[PDB]
Amino acid sequence: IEDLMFEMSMWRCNDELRARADEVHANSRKDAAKHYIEFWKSIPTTEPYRVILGDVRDKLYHTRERAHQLLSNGHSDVPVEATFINLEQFLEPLELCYRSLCSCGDRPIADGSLLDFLRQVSTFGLSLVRLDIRQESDRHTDVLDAITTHLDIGSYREWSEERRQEWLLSELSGKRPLFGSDLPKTEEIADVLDTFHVIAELPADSFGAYIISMATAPSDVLAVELLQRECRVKQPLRVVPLFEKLADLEAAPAAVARLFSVDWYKNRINGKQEVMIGYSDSGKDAGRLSAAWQLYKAQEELVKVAKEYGVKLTMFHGRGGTVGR
Amino acid sequence: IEDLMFEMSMWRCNDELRARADEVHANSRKDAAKHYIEFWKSIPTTEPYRVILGDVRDKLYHTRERAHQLLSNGHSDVPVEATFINLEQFLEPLELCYRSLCSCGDRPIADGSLLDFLRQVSTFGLSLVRLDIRQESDRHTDVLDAITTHLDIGSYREWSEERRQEWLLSELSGKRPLFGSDLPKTEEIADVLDTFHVIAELPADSFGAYIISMATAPSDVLAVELLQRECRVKQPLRVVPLFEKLADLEAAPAAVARLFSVDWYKNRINGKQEVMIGYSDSGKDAGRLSAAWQLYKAQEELVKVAKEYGVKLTMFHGRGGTVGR
Ligand SMILES: [Cl-]
């Protein structure tokens, strides 16, 4: 950011960026700000790009200090409003600089370091990569079974698929909390519940998708959805199944259509769905050729099903480095 | 405590108090401890009573400091283990000094300042007085009705006494949380829920009884019990009805017997029940004579009911200062 501030030494801006620069120079905090090396003096309105980028540097500093404290200890005294909280609270001031530069005939300048920076921000965000959480279905099954046993209502394990679907649906559309603090938990059970609490405690733009290994029925996706909602995951992430064994690839389109049939999920999925297609285990239990061909059929029929339900499908290819995977 | 430390200058103790004083002088924290004015030097095992009472002063000092912080700000860094947390963790060392003194033929000394102190602790505890929480039944009903309405299960208001009873019982004996953070609350609703949260945050020996104004049915007491359990009140306080209007005094023995009829409540009540008897409103809506007489009969029949159910009843007489109350 300091190198970018050095280059954005222009003085022409449109009335927009001038107004905003006046805003920042208003709350300029006439202080020494000696923790910085460069630009430790309050930036003058002569060079307005440097003013706005100056506020951007302050919010970066405080974001770094907050993350470093949050990591090094368990907590941080750094105020959240002093940091970039949004993926675009960061982007906004840079967008403004770009609009101003183009407005003032400086598109060549704007397409330089400022553009590089814009693409880095829009591409990498506040957390360099979005993290996926992958876990096998049977662990979610164990969790739910502990819950239904504890609620004196049966055993989710022993329940047929239809019973699982109806119950999960009723609990997702219901308004009463499920388990409480007093739920008996295995180390595994508490592992997955705690991972959900960890996901809820953390920023939304840090995570990607929750991938369910050995997914076979909608009860598994709905299970993860309910387990998220009940772990108070404020902005729950998209759930995606992983079909890797060959039989799962044969049965996959049927299962996806049956999932989209659920009006609730089709309404909350918001027209977009991702499903992972594994390449590792297919050519292991059956013929490599049979695996490749069945994969082709799988992609084809998955797209068919998604178009049939008016949902934008993006398929996740779990390819390896070796041709055998 | 310092004056007590000064008088307890004996050198004879039994082996019990000797062992303990040696323990305390072991972890004596060989430091300056200059915040105290008197006894700032590590107390020598020569004066064992002073060793023990000296530790008592450390725990009192830290208890006062924690209480003062907890009051003046919202929180305290003072570790809880440094304080007296139990109303008798305090009593123990003093009991020990008393036992030791009597062992050594010093019962007279034990019956001086030490005894006064024992009685002051055992009578006033860590919180000078135990605080009652009183609220009228209709407010608990409003809360419950908001919950049953929000849970799309009906209207607690419109429900018969029997329906209220069966539902409350099922919820008391159930293990699932009731409402969540998303329960719509009036300012009154959130008032009573918040008082329960305040009760849960605070120590148990700080509170006494929860008095229900306008109590008429077991549903009212069961209601307060459920609201305590659901507000995570770890050690819920005893619920006690208040009969003050003349009709309520007439119906009181019946309503109290009807309460004891619920085996669930009678088994949890631990053989003890308190019920309040108001003296203010009776001689206002009827005569003073009719009210006095009805109060007498009411006490009589209440005792009969409690003896029939093997419950030790203690009655709370809300007498005023004027004869008319
Ligand atoms: Cl119980």
Curated annotation (Swiss-Prot), chains A, B:
Subcellular location: Cytoplasm
Tissues expressing the protein: Expressed in all plant organs, with higher levels in roots.
Catalytic residues as annotated in Swiss-Prot or TrEMBL: K284
Stated induction or repression of this protein's expression: Upon inorganic phosphate (Pi) deprivation.
Post-translational changes noted in the entry: Enhanced activity by phosphorylation at pH 7.3 by lowering Km and sensitivity to inhibition by L-malate and L-aspartate, while enhancing activation by glucose 6-phosphate.
Function: Through the carboxylation of phosphoenolpyruvate (PEP) it forms oxaloacetate, a four-carbon dicarboxylic acid source for the tricarboxylic acid cycle. Contributes probably to the adaptation to inorganic phosphate (Pi) deprivation.
Subunit structure of this chain's protein: Homotetramer.
Homology family: Belongs to the PEPCase type 1 family.
Protein name, per record: Phosphoenolpyruvate carboxylase 1
Residues of the full protein shown: 319 to 643 of 967
